[model samples]
Target: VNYCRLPCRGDNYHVGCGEPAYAQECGQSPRTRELLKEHRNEILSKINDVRDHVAKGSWGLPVAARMKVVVWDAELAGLAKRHTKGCVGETHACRNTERFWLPGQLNFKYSGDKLPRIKELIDDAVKKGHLQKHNITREIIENYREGDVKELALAISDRVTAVGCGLTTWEDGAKARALLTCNFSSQNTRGRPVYKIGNSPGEKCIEKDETYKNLCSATEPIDPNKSN
Candidate 1:
């Protein structure tokens, strides 16, 4: 039901969020956002790693041919950064997009003064069932609910094309926690199969990338141009 504001398609356009990520800089300052970007590739790798396993039928998941390669998005990152300003772990309001949140409450009591490391967060998310098969045939994209596992499912969903993350630490009394939020391009629409079942990875794609054969490439080139 959303309309495009730029020369973009699908959920790639922004509503009140300002210029789409592919068009111009839209969120927080690069330096502040860099805190989350520091482990960008590492985070993306961990995500695809889980997704790859699921795509190849590891852990009994059906093989998928069109799992897109997730990359860092500036607008999402900026929005993530903006969300962290409250140090609240809840997913922020974003229409026509998808999000995954890791409040990192599992071991927050032990985290002390430092925010949980990126590796630690990814591991926790995976352990919390980020690798399972999902049924996307429901009437609408599932709504968010407290303590629900949908956030983990969002990470490995096949149609999710790009992601941007934000991480921040907060404390109340002696309690401290870190929250990692990642935003996705697809809203996981209804009636869409989570992914295309296939004989092997990379067998089918909207557009394939040579470097990452099994993963779909971005619909349009990503140009953050943060320095501009």
Candidate 2:
């Protein structure tokens, strides 16, 4: 998992972990980042523990809403601008996630364990037959259980990107390999400025909505005499 990329020219940074509380300009070094992975593992496991404790079931999966799981070469990348790090926190209507990358409201009840989630990603890829099983490499997947959500997220990200950015856009491939998901990135709906990727490029992702009908495309210009 890549650390915060939001700060390109600063010292207050830590990869694979959240910045230490009240971190100074010199806070969170490389060793700190190495430690963050361990920290994140513990944190993620416990989150599942609580979810499983409450018996949310199945396994678990990294959840980054409104953003593609891609980035950091499709490994679980961090907030575009946030330096603070850590896994996600509990959901609440009155608040956004404490971290920028966490997925917003989702079908938690239907959700299963992380294992199944991971399996589903692999299964989807295998079914798609994009890059044969070996090309994906086992090393790429083991991190989710070993210590990094980035690897797991990337595994899913890469395949999805290949299909959407590759297969769907090509001239003769009409096999419905990619989906048109809304991704719900209504940036302006919020009352304040929020983190946006790649220089605030909001609402640029493919297939943003089905309808909330963008109010009728290509309407004919009404002639003045038509009123008669």
Candidate 3:
């Protein structure tokens, strides 16, 4: 939540690797520890419940859209809507298009301060009969194998980061403003908004920076996998 990037690189790093991201932020409590140990199935059940919600935000899909991360053996393989910018107009503030996540990246991203403690909550929720665990595992992801498509998915994520770095003002550090007003309409079936980066992020409904106007108007990103 604090950082705007994924895999947060925080929990994914090795503590002994000497990377700053892996520095342990917090630890779990003893009471919660016993709960998970006593009721091990509790945690996985809770994780699966939230996975569907996370996918909705990532894919910009409607809440009702196939809300399962795993279906039998095939998981994370589906066409989803990817929100693109400049979609905002007079009536709408955002729009979406076809996109997909690295099916390989579909896993419980256990990170942040709440993670260690989450086991306890899951244990509690399961005991209360509020959540249930499902046998949700995909063949490729479980086998610890990656396909050729992994590179393309990674490349897409890099480009997204690059585009989000647009400067407030052009001319390369000319004491200008940053112009990345990345916004999306609410989830579909309600406030479906079109993301709009206007002439400027600081000031909307104005003329666009001529040098990078073409970028703001860009339609869809190139599909690298097509060539592969």
Candidate 4:
């Protein structure tokens, strides 16, 4: 069994690593120190009780399963709703679709300072006739990821200080925006190649997107025992 240990500090008031907020008060009085020391066993007992409760499933499930449930329920749900319209849209069912093909009537929230930069980029592209205004889709944003999908996500997070439109709160919105950009960009670069490698490998062998294709292909025949 792997046992994890919390770091300790020299000061008695310090809980672990650093002093607790109440440390100063506790340290100021000898009576307080004796009282706390006397109650230490009781505190430990209570902590063990809580730990037992957690181990017995009082906190719903283990941390890993809880995280999986959250990812599927919260993050994936939002992405599906925003990008795929509950999978009713065209891009929802197919690949190689242009970014801006979503239904034009759907109202999207575009709040934040980074929107200006994104808009500027899009507008520049549009003026050059390289892209159309209606082509931007939540699907495109949702699917973006970084570095062939094996590497952790890397995207420009929106600055919290920048004002924007979309979700009403200022909570984690920047992180979400950055995640969206990363996922969309990743999807744009890797989607078709990945799909082809998974579903149809015998067809065309274009070298342009081969790196992504190779990564996808390599993942297809994975041996469970070989995985770290």
The lDDT values for all models are 0.50, 0.22, 0.21, 0.21
- Cα lDDT tens digits, model 1, 19-95, are 33321121232112244444777767777776666666565556766676777667665566555444445432333
Pick out the ten consecutive residues of candidate 4 with the lowest summed lDDT.
63-72
Q: State the lDDT of candidate 2 residue by residue for 1-228, as single tens digits.
A: 334444323344333344443223222321112213443343233222222211111122222112222111112222211221211122121211223222221111111222233224223433333222223333333232213232222223211211110001101122211211111111111222111112211132343212211111112121211111
Question: Where is model 4 more than 4 Å wrong at Cα?
Answer: 1-31, 36-38, 63-228
User: Which candidate do you rate higher for TM-score, 3 or 4?
Assistant: 3
Pairs of residues at least 3 apart in sequence or in different chains that clash in candidate 1: none
* Candidates in descending TM-score order: 1, 2, 3, 4
Off by over 4 Å in 1: 1-37, 95-119, 129-148, 206-213, 217-228
Runs of candidate 2 with Cα error greater than 4 angstroms are 1-32, 56-77, 80-82, 85-228
Q: Count the backbone clashes (under 3 Å) in each candidate.
A: 0, 8, 11, 13
Off by over 4 Å in 3: 1-40, 50-61, 70-228
* Residues 120-171, model 4: lDDT tens digits: 4223322322122133222322343331222111111100000001111111
Best by TM-score: 1
Residue 36's lDDT in candidate 3? 24
Q: Which ten residues in a row have the lowest lDDT in candidate 1?
A: 101-110
Across 63-158, the per-residue lDDT of candidate 3 in tens digits comes to 221121211111111100011111111112111212221221211112223333444433433333322212111222112123232221221121
Residue 126 in candidate 1, Cα distance off native in Å: 4.5
